[PDB]
Design a protein around this ligand. Sequence first.
Ligand SMILES: CC[C@H]1OC(=O)[C@H](C)[C@@H](O[C@H]2C[C@@](C)(OC)[C@@H](O)[C@H](C)O2)[C@H](C)[C@@H](O[C@@H]2O[C@H](C)C[C@H](N(C)C)[C@H]2O)[C@](C)(O)C[C@@H](C)CN(C)[C@H](C)[C@@H](O)[C@]1(C)O
Ligand SMILES: Nc1nc2c(ncn2[C@@H]2O[C@H](COP(=O)(O)OP(=O)(O)O)[C@@H](O)[C@H]2O)c(=O)[nH]1
Ligand SMILES: [Ca+2]
Ligand SMILES: [Mg+2]
Length: 298
Amino acid sequence: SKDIKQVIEIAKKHNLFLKEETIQFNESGLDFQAVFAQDNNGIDWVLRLPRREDVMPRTKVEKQALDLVNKYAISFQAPNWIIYTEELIAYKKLDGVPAGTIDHNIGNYIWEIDINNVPELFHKSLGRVLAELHSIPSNKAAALDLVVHTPEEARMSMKQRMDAVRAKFGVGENLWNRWQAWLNDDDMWPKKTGLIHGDVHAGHTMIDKDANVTGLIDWTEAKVTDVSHDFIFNYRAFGEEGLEALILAYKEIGGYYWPKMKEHIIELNAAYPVSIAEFALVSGIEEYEQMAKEALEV
Ligand SMILES: CC[C@H]1OC(=O)[C@H](C)[C@@H](O[C@H]2C[C@@](C)(OC)[C@@H](O)[C@H](C)O2)[C@H](C)[C@@H](O[C@@H]2O[C@H](C)C[C@H](N(C)C)[C@H]2O)[C@](C)(O)C[C@@H](C)CN(C)[C@H](C)[C@@H](O)[C@]1(C)O
Ligand SMILES: Nc1nc2c(ncn2[C@@H]2O[C@H](COP(=O)(O)OP(=O)(O)O)[C@@H](O)[C@H]2O)c(=O)[nH]1
Ligand SMILES: [Ca+2]
Ligand SMILES: [Mg+2]
């Protein structure tokens, strides 16, 4: 009840007037508490209540990415932080629903689509969305604090991140030689980079009733690098068929394509343990430590 009252008062201080009976809390994270509420005009909002100091420095990158997408992109919605202070971030909820959500059990997906009959519009729409995203001219930005890689630098980045993980955690033997083989295969690696979302998965892909992707949320991992990261979810969730469907739609609307694109994404997928290990470090959450160690094949 006091939580509810505080939400109302913080929102009110930012001229956001809420229906108290609609206020819903997600379980807080280390960084903020996510809150849902409807305003006095019937409009649904998403609030982030900060739980750490230095809100502006820690959100600079996400906000730069959001600014780029809101300026340039028409095929998808992204959060537009109409309220952006150290005390509150809030945006009008995007249309649609997440295609799936990570549950609070094993962590499997609770799906809004039929995993055994994925609508083909999901892949066609996501391919259009990603092709638009990855061609945004991040260079026209006067200021850019996103990580920015050339193709060569994206490869060196993966090499370094892998060495780093093999030295804090160690890395299984056979997994390493796969990784190193991938790194050393010139023809496999893309010759172009782009602005990526960096955390594309069903929980962040908003869909309409026909499973068109209409929006993307949670842009904290945005950067200019290998576009391949935004294809990984499709491969993991939908296998080779959903990966191929996404690549096809992307290529056919003009997205960057190279002959070994599928094979490269599959090798990047095998490097997924690098990202879990890194999250374990930054978050300090014991569950991700054990998750990282199993994924790294100690
Ligand atoms: C397709 C099957 C599965 O789903 C996938 O694999 C997802 C695409 C996967 O994501 C894939 C693909 C990719 C590109 O992230 C979208 C990669 O970074 C991660 C490691 O794995 C998710 C989104 C990961 O969650 C991401 O973990 C990152 C380390 C941080 C990131 N965010 C917070 C910045 C977060 O979203 C996570 C670590 O798997 C979440 C964790 C709580 C529970 N998993 C262990 C479950 C059981 C999954 O295995 C799965 C449901 O069975
Ligand atoms: N349906 C919907 N959910 C949202 C929206 N924005 C945030 N969320 C939800 O709030 C959760 C947390 O928000 P997110 O931006 O991903 O922050 P996180 O807690 O750091 O992952 C998400 O997993 C979504 O379920 C939105 O526009 N629509
Ligand atoms: Ca995030
Ligand atoms: Mg999220």
